Chains A and B, each alone.
Chain A
């Protein structure tokens, strides 16, 4: 036999260092930390990572109008990753600094009423999390072993500090959504190469 979709994913995530957590583990994140190394760096349970990507994917696909989902990254590594992720699901990409007030302030030129919000890291993308808590906006976030999980509905346990990890997760997430929508047939061949998501340093 060959590998299932899960196993190809675990192979890819294990190649992207997605399992590598940080030195700390938040008490809310401990339900995913499989164990701790002698170096003291925790290990993320890649098993649990997979269903949360599936859980996140089922939430995404039920959003009937994708332009009404927003995806964001404060850090520079997630810029190219989230920009392409939006290009393929139809979401709305907001890369860089978030203008404070874009979910609460209705007279602001930039303004929105998203039904779903996907964030690269709660610790660096704190401001949109705090804003979505004022607008009944549910939240999806990639959470490292020390991400503060306040106002976060679906936290995917995953390395979100790495150049390869961030782009790998979004590529892997965008794949799962397209399958459910039917734009990609059964049969994992998705000719969009994974390296497209990793950003380029000029």
Chain B
């Protein structure tokens, strides 16, 4: 019956985004932190939102996470993605192709070509 609704879920993601490093694992510190980054109208709702920022930040601290875009996480996925090996692993030293592939190469006029050999 304690399914967290949209407001608690949406605010919880959004509040982490603006303030990630400033948060922690303590529910009560998170309750207090949440107190001075927003204006709310009920303390029951505050604990619900702080309740959905506390363990959510375990699963963030554990692994990746949905729509919430963490800068320290999202830069470093990009930084590691913009990567190349010590040279092109697509190498053309040995291209072993079937006869009917060579037949195509012949039809193109390229029966003799670097590194192509029948099997």
Interface of A toward B, CB cutoff 8 Å = 3, 7, 10-12, 14-16, 19, 34-35, 37, 43, 45-47, 80, 164, 168, 193-196, 198, 200
Chain A residue numbers with a CB within 8 Å of B92 are 11-12, 15
Q: How far is the CA of A12 from the CA of B88 in the complex (A)?
A: 11
A15 B91 Cβ-Cβ under 8 A: yes
Partner of A46, one of B87, B89, B98, B104: B104
Interface string of B93-119 (1 = CB under 8 A from A): 001011011011101101001111000
B88 A34 Cβ-Cβ under 8 A: no
Interface string of B68-98 (1 = CB under 8 A from A): 0000000000001101110111111001011
Q: Total number of A-B contacts with CB less than 8 angstroms?
A: 64
A12 B90 Cβ-Cβ under 8 A: yes
B108 A200 Cβ-Cβ under 8 A: no
Partner of B108, one of A3, A46, A194: A46
Partner of A11, one of B84, B107, B114: B114
Chain B residue with the shortest CB-CB distance to A10: B110
Tell whether A47 pairs with B116 under 8 Å between CB atoms, given A12-B92, A37-B98, A37-B100.
no
Chain A residue numbers with a CB within 8 Å of B90 are 12, 15-16, 164, 168, 194-195, 198
A193 B104 Cβ-Cβ under 8 A: no
A19 B88 Cβ-Cβ under 8 A: no
Q: How far is the CA of A164 from the CA of B90 in the complex (A)?
A: 8
Tell whether A195 pairs with B103 under 8 Å between CB atoms, given A7-B113, A12-B92.
no
B84 A196 Cβ-Cβ under 8 A: yes
Q: How far is the CA of A37 from the CA of B101 in the complex (A)?
A: 9
Interface residues on B, range: 20 to 34
Q: How far is the CA of A195 from the CA of B81 in the complex (A)?
A: 12
A195 B100 Cβ-Cβ under 8 A: no
Chain B residue numbers with a CB within 8 Å of A35 are 100, 103-104
Question: Most B CB atoms within 10 A — which of A14, A46, A193, A196?
Answer: A14
B108 A10 Cβ-Cβ under 8 A: yes
A195 B104 Cβ-Cβ under 8 A: no
Tell whether A195 pairs with B89 under 8 Å between CB atoms, given A11-B114, A43-B101.
yes
B8-61: which residues lie under 8 A (CB-CB) from chain A? none
Chain B residue numbers with a CB within 8 Å of A16 are 90
Tell whether A19 pairs with B104 under 8 Å between CB atoms, given A11-B113, A168-B90.
yes
Chain A residue with the shortest CB-CB distance to B82: A196
B83 A193 Cβ-Cβ under 8 A: no
Chain B residue numbers with a CB within 8 Å of A80 are 81
Q: How far is the CA of A156 from the CA of B92 in the complex (A)?
A: 23
B95 A47 Cβ-Cβ under 8 A: no
Chain A residue with the shortest CB-CB distance to B64: A202
Q: How far is the CA of A189 from the CA of B97 in the complex (A)?
A: 27
